[PDB]
Symmetry: C2
Subunit: 150 residues, 2 copies
């Protein structure tokens, strides 16, 4: 089925993504038609909370970032507590122990299907250029495969 | 269909591989139980023979290297004519046009499914660490996709 195919690619991306970065969590944050996100796949190291299957109603993608991510925006944050973020934003990340994160888009048929997101937990992390390139390329490869499968 | 899904992934791998390396050819070379390989997908630049749909039996894999490739062996060759190769090896490459090559494994369910192979056809080419890493990760990601998809 189309749903089984997407999930297989998503499980591949989170597993390979966490291996590539040796970070604490990688997820696929998939959007519904109103850009409400569901954590549909997760690779997470031992001891950290599981984000899998959580629904996170974060309005900034629908309201502000859909176009930039469609166009290939990448967001990397070394220290979420030093990024000018509001408490509402921080309270989504605190339970998952996020301290640093890297966000790349999954664009399929020119549409923003979701985000591949890496977390460093309870520890800041400066994401390096070639790490970002490898992670962006992983998301693109996965997205291109899904484009070709159907 | 496993076969149709397969071909879609292979086509993504060869196209992305040739884009990443800007080389003359990238192929997927898939093994059967004699460890005879078939070129099952190809991206090739203008002017070079199409290696697509070639069955090429090379005994060195089954005789020496299958397990090593399972474990992540590569072949990086800057100039095949300075590599101490036999006429039988040179003869099997001559119709394709290979001057330099990069061979990385595709491992699925802990077996050597095939090789992802890049060719430079009219000049030597010293394959760089970053290229080897990118090409290896491409092959690994595509392999894991196939492993999970069915
Ligand atoms: C936009 C925004 N949200 C996120 C969300 C996540 N990062 C993660 O790691 C995860 C997985 C746990 C999620 C989910 C990011 C990365 C961004 C930034 C996008 C970018 O710059 O490219 C955002 N959301 C909020 C939430 C806040 N705003 C509201 O109106 C309400 C209500 C909120 C509470 C739920 C904020 C403050 C931002 C950033 C500011 C902005 O760009 O508008
Ligand atoms: C082993 C060997 N063969 C290949 C084959 C290919 N390179 C490519 O680019 C392609 C696609 C067109 C193929 C197919 C490689 C890369 C290697 C090296 C493996 C390694 O060390 O990792 C090899 N095969 C031969 C051929 C020769 N030996 C025979 O018994 C018969 C028969 C032959 C003629 C068909 C040779 C000389 C080698 C290298 C030495 C060895 O590994 O035994
Ligand atoms: Mg199917
Ligand atoms: Mg690495
Ligand atoms: Mg399509
Ligand atoms: Mg399987």
């Amino acid at each position: 089925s189309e749903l089984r195919d997407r999930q297989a690619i998503f499980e591949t991306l989170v597993a390979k993504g966490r291996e590539l970065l040796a970070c604490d969590r990688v997820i696929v944050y998939a959007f519904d038609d109103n850009y409400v996100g569901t954590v549909v796949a997760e690779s997470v190291a031992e001891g950290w909370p599981q984000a899998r299957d959580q629904v996170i109603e974060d309005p900034c993608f629908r309201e502000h970032w859909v176009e930039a991510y469609r166009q290939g925006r990448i967001q990397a944050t070394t220290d979420i507590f030093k990024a000018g973020l509001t408490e509402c934003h921080l309270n989504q990340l605190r339970p998952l122990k996020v301290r640093a994160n890297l966000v790349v888009p999954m664009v399929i048929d020119d549409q923003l299907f979701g985000l591949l997101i890496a977390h460093q937990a309870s520890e800041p992390r400066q994401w390096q250029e070639i790490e970002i390139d490898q992670f962006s390329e992983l998301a693109s490869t996965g997205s291109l495969v899904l484009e070709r499968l159907h």
